[PDB]
């Protein structure tokens, strides 16, 4: 009853892992809960308020009682508990997030972060600032190599090395890089793994 709201919150955190697990991974997190954590923050503010109040009270009334210690001990733990929840949730949220910023940006010619992440505005803007700052953070890693990467893609090794892509209602032709593949619905291109990696992440290509 004391710290249990955090147990319920992480209990809810669990279900997003369930949605990232088997899964199938489309992202589409329901929302970030600002309300329930606001409840948590009001509860914890309550706590630390009574804490500094009693911290004033030992200075006068309690007179360093053996019992007093407990309040600064036990209730202190509760603060930690909320923290233990609040970060555990939060890191989970960053884990479901940064990976998404990994596997697709997105990809050639990124060329900008847009239309991605169906959560969009529904997810908190505090995370989105972190996010845009994070893909800005990875643009520098993109700019060191020079390898080249091409890192966001090709988690799965090339074979061999030409494939066949069957158009999937995409228009097209938007293939400007390397060559004008001239995208055309109902058209399969006997194209090398090279531009396939880049174009398959967008949603144009279908069968590898």
């Amino acid at each position: 009853m004391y710290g249990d709201l955090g147990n319920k919150l992480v209990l809810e955190a669990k279900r997003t892992k369930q949605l990232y697990a088997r899964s199938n991974q489309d992202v589409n997190l329901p929302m970030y809960h600002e309300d329930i954590i606001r409840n948590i923050l009001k509860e914890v503010s309550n706590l630390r308020k009574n804490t500094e109040y009693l911290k004033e009270q030992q200075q006068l009334g309690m007179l360093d009682d053996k019992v007093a210690k407990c309040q600064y001990f036990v209730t202190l733990l509760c603060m930690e508990r909320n923290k233990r929840c609040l970060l555990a949730y939060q890191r989970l949220r960053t884990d479901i997030l940064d990976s998404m910023a990994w596997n697709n940006n997105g990809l050639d010619l990124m060329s900008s972060i847009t239309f991605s992440q169906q959560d969009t505005n529904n997810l908190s803007h505090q995370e989105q600032e972190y996010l845009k700052e994070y893909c800005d953070l990875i643009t520098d890693l993109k700019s060191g190599d020079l390898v080249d990467i091409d890192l966001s893609g090709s988690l799965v090794p090339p074979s061999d090395a030409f494939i066949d892509v069957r158009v999937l209602k995409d228009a097209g032709e938007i293939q400007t890089e390397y060559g004008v593949f001239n995208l055309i619905k109902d058209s399969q291109f006997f194209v090398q793994q090279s531009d396939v990696e880049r174009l398959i992440q967008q949603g144009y290509l279908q069968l590898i």
């Binding site: 884990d95 990976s99 090794p157 061999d160």
Partner: protein, 181 residues
């Protein structure tokens, strides 16, 4: 963020690895290329065997410009001595190329017409040697203790399939026991 798997290798990645092993070939051809890691070759002579890396043999086999040799250990008459030697030492896993599963998948997709008596035989043999060996692993897996195991000679694929399991419940098992002293 590798996502999957991530701690264990991917089934594909172990083929990605094994294709780095060289094996002999029979080139139809008679630039340069230095490439990087190959070291080979002076222009390959037709009707002459030579040693090259796998992924290139496979590559040149799709174009049917080269005929891969069968490994001396891949034969049914050869496999017979191996299952014979395996039934009779229920404890040890015998002697394995260590890639044999994955070469058994790969060389059968394309090269199949090159083998002498490939049909309905060897696949029957290795699907078997990949049976009694697997159950022998599950019955050798009861003896689990921390920290030791002899997995002796065991395929890379066989390692990779059961890895999360063993190296997870070893991490629940050894975790109480280290910590209870």
């Amino acid at each position: 963020l590798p996502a999957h798997l991530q701690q264990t290798f991917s089934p594909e990645e172990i083929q990605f690895i094994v294709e780095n092993e060289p094996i002999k070939i029979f080139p139809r051809i008679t630039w340069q290329l230095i490439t990087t890691d190959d070291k080979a070759l002076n222009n390959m002579v037709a009707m002459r065997s030579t040693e090259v890396v796998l992924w290139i043999a496979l590559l040149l086999k799709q174009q049917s410009k080269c005929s891969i040799v069968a490994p001396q250990w891949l034969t049914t008459k050869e496999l017979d001595r191996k299952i014979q030697y395996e039934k009779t030492h229920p404890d040890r896993f015998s002697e394995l190329p260590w890639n044999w599963l994955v070469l058994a998948r790969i060389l059968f997709n394309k090269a199949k017409d090159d083998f002498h008596d490939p049909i309905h035989e060897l696949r029957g043999k290795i699907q078997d040697l990949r049976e009694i060996r697997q159950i022998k692993v599950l019955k050798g897996l009861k003896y689990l203790n921390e920290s030791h195991l002899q997995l002796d000679n065991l395929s890379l694929l066989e390692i990779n399939e059961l890895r999360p399991f063993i190296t997870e419940i070893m991490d629940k098992l050894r975790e109480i026991h280290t910590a209870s002293l």
